[PDB]
Symmetry: none
């Protein structure tokens, strides 16, 4: 019953306010990357992708 | 899209630390009840009144 | 101790339940002696709601009825 | 602003294995600085320093599963 077990990512690094990295375990066998956007909505970044990278950095150089 | 498309009701209310209620938007047809547990986990809740009700009251009556 | 502290510092009563696009309910604990009601808005701003006010009951309904 | 920074203080050290969740919050009107919030297995949450070689060592232990 993963939180992030569906589509993954096509977002604008512009509107991400926070990025949460959740470890795999009980309810989810894989690591989930959830992203909170300005408008308050959430999304799942791709554990298996590059984009989530610059995203973190960006958030840290703010 | 959403993160919540496989909601659950198997959760123990004393183990919830916070509950996020996301308003239905374009990319997601329905409202979402994100529950974060004591161990940091996240799960999607069934949009059934008695549940989140009994929950928001245990969260707000700490 | 506690590296965390309450996110909320003051609550907004005069809020337009319309623009509220999300709501987070936080249980009390080490981080904060009281529970917290943080509502984000369509514009991206965030405000805290009063626990001794029905408004949140209202807002949560409006948010869950789609 | 109704909000302030959650991280009123930080911890320079703890074991990455204990971390179940790591939340990265970018600076804004709520807080003049970015924040690194880690949740541990026991349930506690700590704030970390923004010094790359540590959280990257944590972010890895988190995704290697």
């Amino acid at each position: 019953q993963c939180l992030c077990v569906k589509t993954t990512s096509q977002v604008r690094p512009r509107h991400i306010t926070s990025l949460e990295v959740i470890k795999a375990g009980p309810h989810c066998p894989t690591a989930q990357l959830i992203a909170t956007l300005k408008n308050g909505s959430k999304i799942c970044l791709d554990l298996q992708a590059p984009l989530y990278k610059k995203i973190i950095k960006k958030l840290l150089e703010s």
